[PDB]
A paper describes a structure:
The ferric iron uptake (Fiu) transporter is a TBDT responsible for import of molecules containing the catecholate functional group. The structure of Fiu consists of a 22-stranded transmembrane β-barrel characteristic of the TBDT superfamily, with a number of extended extracellular loops that might serve in the initial steps of substrate binding. In addition to its role in iron uptake, Fiu has also been shown to be important for sensitivity to antimicrobials that share the common feature of a catecholate functional group or the analogous dihydroxypyridine moiety.
The structure of Fiu was solved in three different crystal forms, revealing Fiu in two distinct states. In crystal state 1, extracellular loops 7–9 of the β-barrel were disordered, as was the extended extracellular loop of the N-terminal plug domain, which occluded the lumen of the Fiu β-barrel. The disorder of the plug domain loop in crystal state 1 opens a large cavity in the interior of Fiu to the external environment, whereas, in crystal state 2, this cavity is present but occluded in the lumen of the Fiu barrel. Therefore, it is likely to be undesirable for Fiu to exist in the open-channel state, which would result from simultaneous displacement of the plug subdomain and disorder of the plug domain loop. Although the internal cavity would be inaccessible to Fe–DHB in the closed state, because of the fully ordered plug loop, it would be accessible in state 1, as this loop is disordered. Glu-108 is disordered in the open state of Fiu and is not within bonding distance of docked Fe–DHB (5.3 Å) but may form interactions with polar substrate groups in vivo or generally stabilize the binding pocket. The observed crystal states may represent conformational transitions the receptor undergoes during substrate binding and transport.
Author numbering: 50 to 106, 116 to 540, 563 to 596, 608 to 642, 656 to 760
């Protein structure tokens, strides 16, 4: 049977073949891995993919490219930019390399697809309660109930509140509710209805000065004392008691499926979703012109505070039709996947008055101040993108051993954008009032439309060398809206060994991007392992070696491995280790800021104890050696996020 650590099939019907028979570098992170590791969010889940992390500012990076706009939920773009909890996730599908034929407007470096939980054919209840470091509390509930011969419901509930063990005042609070019903299970006609609501209320973290890090230099001769005063206390909060981050997600999904016959299925999915967010966060600046020296003693010196504010609403409405069909023409088998997608996305950024923040003491920051919140001023920016997309995939079974595949996708989009600024101010990009226009009036500065076409295509071939091993090649030609062109070549090999419960892959890749700014190249090597070495022994991890020629936020070496062993009927033990290579900032870094970050190791451990079939406990320890490191650094180079210290998570799991 399948390993819980190596799901055999993508959930997306655009993938007609099992992962091991797919000519792409594709890692699936199962629900069981997420649970065993205590992963509460997408970023945590992604520790199982080497090199993928939120190294910037915080945004997730893959192969040197921001991936924030290449996150999907059930194959539909995730709108807005909020952290994603794992409570409603069945698995996470990560493609390393292009996926424009599958999603159109995605990063040619990789995509991430979170697969939502659906009603199952069995009845059961799981619940979890957790306590952890820094007042961490979390509760989850997952109820599945079969309600007739062909109907099932599922409900997932989550609540979490925590402070931050490494950071004063930073905190996160959220809850989520995700009810579903499915009709017609086990028949030719199925209807899935999904809803999801999440609310978050957080204190955001702008990070801390980079003084004293490797590569840091004071920005002037007159501030040379900062070459000797040392790293600031990594627990220091440089924001204010007014900083906050609020968001809500509301998503409704309706999926109809009709089997035309045993080998042909048509699907229609409608989703409406809205993500609202507003925040006030403190960004600190440490250039010569940002530093105040009330006396010559550095204990009195300050850096300037900048308010990073946002008040935004994103909406999407999309309808997607997919058709899959398997049939022969002569001796050639066909696996077809084709469809059409209609989408409207909108975004409103609500204008707010400028917020002014007092300077912050470098070594003794005073965050007790209450500058106040945001006030809308009615000068808004509004955007709309309408997209029509059509695609076709086919895998040709030429012989038992040889398969050819290909896909093509066409996107046509229309984008409208308008923006108004309240005139007469001075902060940020202020505007002088036109003649006769009273101060503070919103003045339209942009009002434009645009249209464009994207073509994406890919072709691959795969040869089964043995019953267990194959070799494959894949080629993809991508393009995004500014048209950014990307070509990718890939050759790899995939092996299912140890009763086919363990998947081993290796791939070489080369990607060339033009019109990103000139041409870039990223090439390298990827190895991965997932599944069961023995019935008691589960592993998942990988290794990446890569080089990103320019012509940033990309480790050239990265490793991760998680290993779990069922030591007795009641005792299991797990441990993980990940290496993040050093990274370099070629551009944008201010004078004297670190031009590089050092590589580091992080280790994690787990102990599980089963009391009976209804109750088991789990202890997770994160950053077991309490290692000090730079988790990320912003583009300016003035501020960074320190790696979290050692933390603990203790969970009671109940099953009924
Ligand atoms: C399915 C249906 C369809 O409509 O929706 C029902 C669902 C939407 O209801 C869930 C929601 C109404 O529950 C709100 C509750 C979870 O929040 C409590 C929280 C605000 O207190 C913490 C508080 C600020 O902080 C504590 C301290 C700081 O004072
Ligand atoms: C779990 C519990 C029991 O424990 O049972 C849950 C179940 C009784 O709740 C019902 C829920 C699952 O319904 C989903 C609802 C949100 O459907 C959206 C539909 C209207 O689609 C509109 C479509 C996308 O968009 C329309 C367009 C205008 O945007
Ligand atoms: C107690 C916990 C549980 O481990 O942690 C202890 C930890 C401290 O030591 C873990 C270490 C012993 O694990 C080694 C293993 C995870 O490496 C597998 C990798 C080399 O892939 C080879 C590949 C699958 O091999 C193919 C197969 C045919 O042999
Ligand atoms: C008893 C507890 C709980 O199981 O284990 C404590 C401790 C032994 O765990 C160490 C942890 C770091 O292992 C990570 C694991 C995934 O193994 C990966 C492999 C790289 O380790 C070989 C090894 C560390 O490297 C040797 C050398 C190359 O540095
Ligand atoms: C089952 C795993 C048990 C291993 C426990 C060893 C923890 C090693 O962690 C140790 O913590 C010390 C105090 O924080 C630090 O000073 C050491 O540098 C670090 O090695
Ligand atoms: Cl996240
Ligand atoms: Cl592609």
């Amino acid at each position: 049977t399948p390993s819980l650590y190596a799901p055999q099939q993508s959930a997306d019907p655009k993938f007609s073949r099992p992962v091991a028979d797919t000519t792409r570098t594709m890692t699936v992170i199962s629900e069981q891995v997420i649970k065993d590791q205590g992963a509460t969010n997408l970023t945590d889940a992604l520790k199982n993919v080497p090199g993928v992390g939120a190294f910037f500012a915080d945004a997730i990076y893959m192969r040197g490219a921001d991936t924030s706009n290449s996150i999907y939920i059930d194959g539909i773009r995730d709108i807005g930019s909020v952290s994603r909890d794992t409570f409603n996730t069945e698995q996470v599908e990560v493609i390393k390399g292009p996926s424009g034929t599958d999603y159109g407007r995605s990063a040619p470096t990789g995509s991430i697809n979170m697969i939502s939980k659906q009603p199952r054919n069995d009845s059961g209840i799981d619940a979890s309660a957790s306590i952890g470091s820094a007042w961490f509390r979390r509760g989850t509930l997952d109820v599945n109930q079969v309600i007739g011969d062909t109907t099932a419901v599922r409900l997932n509930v989550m609540g979490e509140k925590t402070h931050d063990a490494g950071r004063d005042k930073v905190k996160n609070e959220r809850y989520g509710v995700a009810p579903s019903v499915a009709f017609g299970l086990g028949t030719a006609n199925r209807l899935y209805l999904n809803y999801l609501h999440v609310t978050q209320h957080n204190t955001p973290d702008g990070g801390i000065p980079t003084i004293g890090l490797p590569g840091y230099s004071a920005p002037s001769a007159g501030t040379a004392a900062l070459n000797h005063s040392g790293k600031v206390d990594t627990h220091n909060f440089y924001g204010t008691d007014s900083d906050y981050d609020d968001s809500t997600t509301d998503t409704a999904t309706m999926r109809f499926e009709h089997d035309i016959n045993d080998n042909t299925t048509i699907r229609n999915t409608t989703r409406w979703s809205r993500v609202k967010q507003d925040y006030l966060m403190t960004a600190i600046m440490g250039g010569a012109s940002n530093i105040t020296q009330p006396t010559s003693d550095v204990n009195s010196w300050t850096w300037s505070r900048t308010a990073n504010t946002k008040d935004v609403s994103n909406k999407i409405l999309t309808n997607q039709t997919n058709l899959t069909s398997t049939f022969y023409t002569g001796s050639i088998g066909h696996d077809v996947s084709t469809g059409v997608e209609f989408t409207r996305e909108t975004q409103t950024n609500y204008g707010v008055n400028p917020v002014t923040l007092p300077a912050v003491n470098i070594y003794h920051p005073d965050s007790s101040i209450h500058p106040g919140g945001l006030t809308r001023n009615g000068a808004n920016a509004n955007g709309q993108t309408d997209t029509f997309a059509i695609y076709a995939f086919d895998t040709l079974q030429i012989t038992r051993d040889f398969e050819l595949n290909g896909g093509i996708r066409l996107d046509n989009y229309h984008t409208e954008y308008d923006s108004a600024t309240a005139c007469g101010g001075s902060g940020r990009g202020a505007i002088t009032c036109p003649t006769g226009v009273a101060k503070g009036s919103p003045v339209t500065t942009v009002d434009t439309a645009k249209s464009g076409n994207l073509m994406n295509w890919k072709a691959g071939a795969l040869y089964h060398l043995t019953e267990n091993g194959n070799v494959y090649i894949n080629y993809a030609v991508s393009q995004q809206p500014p048209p950014q062109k990307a070509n990718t070549s890939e050759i790899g090999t995939k092996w299912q060994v140890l009763d086919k419960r363990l998947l081993l892959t290796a791939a070489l890749f080369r990607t060339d991007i033009e019109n990103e700014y000139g041409k870039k190249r990223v090439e390298g090597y990827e190895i991965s392992v997932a599944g069961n070495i023995t019935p008691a022994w589960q592993v998942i991890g990988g290794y990446t070696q890569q080089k990103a020629t320019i012509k940033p936020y990309t480790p050239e070496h990265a490793f991760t491995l998680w290993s779990q062993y069922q030591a007795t009927d009641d005792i299991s033990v797990g441990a993980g280790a990940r290496y993040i290579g050093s990274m370099h900032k070629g551009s944008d870094g201010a004078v004297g800021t670190p031009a590089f970050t050092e590589g580091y190791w992080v280790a994690d451990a787990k102990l599980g104890y089963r009391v009976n079939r209804n109750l088991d406990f789990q202890l997770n320890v994160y950053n077991l050696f309490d290692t000090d490191y730079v988790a990320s650094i912003n583009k300016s180079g003035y501020r960074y996020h320190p790696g979290e210290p050692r933390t603990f998570l203790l969970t009671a799991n109940m099953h009924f």
